[PDB]
Amino acid sequence: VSVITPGTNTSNQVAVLYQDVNCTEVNVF
Amino acid sequence: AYTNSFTRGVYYPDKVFRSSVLHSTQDLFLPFFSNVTWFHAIHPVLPFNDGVYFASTEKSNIIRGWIFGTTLDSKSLLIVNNATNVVIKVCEFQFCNDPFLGVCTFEYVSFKNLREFVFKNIDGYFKIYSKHTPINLVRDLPQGFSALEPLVDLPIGINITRFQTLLAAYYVGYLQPRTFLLKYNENGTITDAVDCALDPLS
Amino acid sequence: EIVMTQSPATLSVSPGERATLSCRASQSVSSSLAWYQQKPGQAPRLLIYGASTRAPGIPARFSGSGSGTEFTLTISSLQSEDFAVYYCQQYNNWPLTFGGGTKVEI
Amino acid sequence: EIVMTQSPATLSVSPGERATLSCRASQSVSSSLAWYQQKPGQAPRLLIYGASTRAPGIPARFSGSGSGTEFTLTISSLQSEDFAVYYCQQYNNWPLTFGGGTKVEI
Amino acid sequence: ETKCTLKSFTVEKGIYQTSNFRVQPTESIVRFPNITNLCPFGEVFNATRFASVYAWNRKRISNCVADYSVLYNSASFSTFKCYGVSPTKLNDLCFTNVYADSFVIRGDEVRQIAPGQTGKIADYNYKLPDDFTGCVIAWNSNNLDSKVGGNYNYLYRLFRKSNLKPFERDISTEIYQAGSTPCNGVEGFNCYFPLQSYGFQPTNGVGYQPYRVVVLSFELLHAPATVCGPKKSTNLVKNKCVNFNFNGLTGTGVLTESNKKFLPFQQFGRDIADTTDAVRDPQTLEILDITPCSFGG
Amino acid sequence: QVQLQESGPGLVKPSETLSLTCSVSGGSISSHYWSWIRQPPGKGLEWIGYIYYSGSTNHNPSLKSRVTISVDTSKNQFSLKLSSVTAADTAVYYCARGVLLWFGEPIFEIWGQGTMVTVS
Ligand SMILES: *[C@@H]1O[C@H](CO[C@@H]2O[C@@H](C)[C@@H](O)[C@@H](O)[C@@H]2O)[C@@H](O[C@@H]2O[C@H](CO)[C@@H](O[C@@H]3O[C@H](CO)[C@@H](O)[C@H](O)[C@@H]3O)[C@H](O)[C@H]2NC(C)=O)[C@H](O)[C@H]1NC(C)=O
Ligand SMILES: *[C@@H]1O[C@H](CO)[C@@H](O)[C@H](O)[C@H]1NC(C)=O
């Protein structure tokens, strides 16, 4: 599991990447 | 109605002095952003759940006691703040169905207020933390951050499974085992904390 | 010598309900009993051969427990095919004994 | 029963010199003695409560040792304020006894 | 030194680093809290009566000065074993509290009184925590506990629907249920009295004879120590490289005044490497830094 | 800390009972023992008895019938009575606290001011 974020100076929203797993098996891409 | 606990319930886990450091520790804490139950007496029995957080806001000092007992059946700990003096005792004592104050193995004898407490016990030793502050507040719970510090530790050993309170508003909440990151300032008092479980950013 | 008694001699039962039985020995015994089933005209079957343990081949409908004074057996969800005589037995010492037995009706 | 004697009954001493005293019990005793000081008209003080050990509050000017037959106490650098009667005591068995005591002069 | 560092009788022009040096310490100081009374410890050993394992007896000791050396001169104990502390050095230490537990047991059950054991004693009567520091003492008392008429007062919990917590105490005596149908306050096959008497007879083989057992627990916290060995205090010295022992903690360094605003419930502070940095003296409220003595190549 | 204070008569007649009383201040009779002691003028000390929080007590082997001691929880007071007294019984009497170290007899550590008794 990997967290993607811009710098906390700008915002607190993030995204999350589940590496090498089908998304169904877990917006999405 | 349920009020959000926001960011409260941090307490000093150990008395070793530290300053200008970030330190990580795992213990029983109140989880952040949780629905603390709100009670009102204008116009009960609760589960102990291995310790509890209590926070109340008062005028004219209405909340002057607590009782802790497995059954309360009068078949044990009692704390009561009389106007003249504060008293603590451990006894089998007869209690009514709804005890109130009309305006043995141990003993001790010596809105405008916000009083906060934590009660918890482990390995037979029972700990009480507290804090007090002035406030100005109507029909709300003030968002903020402050840290509790130990006052007393008692070798009661008698594990308690429930509790009751004796009686202008108060809130109750329950602890969970979690890990926190505490920031110490130059003076040496906790300023900020982070909860690891909350979200990916934390 | 060890003597043993089984009571009651008959229990009236009807399908779809549990049944309970108890057998006692004149003196303290532990982990040294057997429960035998006796269907009409058949050879006995060994159902229970100790404290709370089932011989291989016996469904979990039969179970039991006990104490030094008295031991008990439960048959859950009694069925029409459970009609039989039940006999407690002990083997702790040389003087073997069977209990009096109990009939369990349909 | 245990009896005990203390000798000599008086020691002449003058400031700036050490002094030595000895007390003996009729039978073998160990780690079971006390030394009491008795200034004129005062209550006794407990100075030594065992073998070679000082109660809390007593300067290191007082010390002692001993054997089963006889025990000894030394007062180094004796001062004018050390004028007192000294009493050995034992407590090993039920029959408590005090020694005869000794006067130590100025 | 250079010659012997190069294993050679001749050396070329250069700068050679061969050794280091340290300032040696010059004095030693001892600074203990002063307690003004002896300790009535004998009360717990000189007592006539003794407790029963179902209701073991506890005593709390504080504000004491005690010398343990006599316990090693005595030979009246059938067993003497301590855990987590070396028994000889107890005279050099301090503690916040001492607890004494006492009871009589079947000698055969002495095997059970150890951290992490298992069995009816370790689960129904006196469960001991897996992490422990303390000492355990036993002596055979068959001469006094047992009598020509037998003795049957001593009871142990034979059955129990659960296992005790460490140092838990439970006087509840609900009739134990071993039958399908529960019976309360009744004597029957289903339920009987949960305690069994020890039948002590004076001719019993030694394994069955009663042994008295006492367990001593040392407890230490940031709450300042109140019980200490018979060590003596000594004057205090500052701004010089000195050996020190505060309240049981040894070390060497340079003591100095400090401006650390310790709170009343605190005793000492630690550095990142988990070593003592500052302390509060047991005789004065001042706060002192410790700095290591000078060294270099 | 604690204090020991004591009271009794100065003069007594022959062949009558004598009584003394000692009271503790600053503490309670919970664990430490108490004991009565006498000091004849210019003579060695003598122990006459001791009693503790349980009421169990032991007296000097000699003069078995001469001495009794009673202890009261109220007002932290204990008293001693002698069946009768003689011209030999003139002495300073002391009440003292006793601590039991490990084994044997308890060592006396805290001593009362003492009171003189004489018979005439
Ligand atoms: C830590 O907290 C101290 C507060 O002082 C401490 O806590 C109090 C409750 C008392 O117990 C005090 O005895 C104790 O020392 C903060 O200290 C503050 O420092 C400033 C620095 O100058 C002091 O001066 C103030 O600042 C203005 C700046 O213009 C000056 O002109 C004035 O002199 C003004 O007083 C200030 O007095 C002092 N606070 C107090 C209550 O005395 C400190 O800043 C804080 N944080 C750190 C990192 O130390
Ligand atoms: C796994 O992911 C691939 C992406 O190319 C998809 O085609 C496939 O159906 C997925 N498997 C599932 C959903 O079981």
Residue numbers in the entry:
A (entry chain C): 595 to 620, 641 to 643
B (entry chain C): 27 to 69, 82 to 113, 116 to 143, 166 to 172, 186 to 242, 263 to 297
C (entry chain E), D (entry chain L): 1 to 106
E (entry chain B): 298 to 594
F (entry chain H): 1 to 120
What did the paper state?
The coronavirus trimeric spike (S) glycoprotein, located on the viral envelope, is the key mediator of viral entry into host cells. The spike protein is made of two subunits: S1 is involved in receptor binding and S2 in membrane fusion. The spike trimer exists in equilibrium between a closed conformation, where all three RBDs lie flat in a “down” conformation, and a partially open conformation, where one RBD adopts an “up” conformation and is exposed for receptor engagement (10–13). We recently reported the potent human mAb, 47D11, capable of cross-neutralizing SARS-CoV and SARS-CoV-2 at 1.3 and 3.8 nM, respectively, without competing with ACE2 binding.
For SARS-CoV-2, only the partially open conformation of the spike was observed, with one Fab bound to each of the two RBDs in down conformation and the remaining RBD in up conformation unoccupied and, in principle, accessible to ACE2 binding. The substoichiometric binding observed for SARS2-S may partially explain our previous observations that 47D11 binds to the SARS-S with higher affinity than SARS2-S [equilibrium dissociation constant (KD) of 0.745 and 10.8 nM, respectively]. Compared to the apo partially open SARS2-S structure, the RBDs are less compact when 47D11 is bound. The apo down conformation of the RBD would preclude binding of 47D11 to the adjacent RBD through steric hindrance. To accommodate the bound Fab on the latter, the first RBD shifts outward by ~7 Å. Unlike mAbs S309 and H014 (44, 47), two other RBD core–targeting cross-neutralizing antibodies, there was no indication from our cryo-EM data that 47D11 can bind to the up conformation of the SARS2-S RBD. In line with this observation, superimposition of the closed and open SARS2-S RBDs revealed that 47D11 would clash with the adjacent NTD and the N331 glycan in the latter conformation. The CDRL3 stabilizes the N343 glycan in an upright conformation, exposing a mutationally constrained hydrophobic pocket, into which the CDRH3 loop inserts two aromatic residues. When the mean mutation effect on expression was mapped on the 47D11-bound RBD, we observed that the hydrophobic pocket, targeted by 47D11, is highly mutationally constrained. In this respect, and unlike C144 (60) and S2M11 (61), which lock the SARS2-S in its closed conformation, our structural data show that 47D11 stabilizes the partially open conformation of the SARS2-S. This may render the spike more susceptible to other mAbs, which target epitopes only exposed in the RBD up conformation, such as H014, CR3022, or antibodies targeting the ACE2 binding ridge, thus making 47D11 a prime candidate for combination treatment.
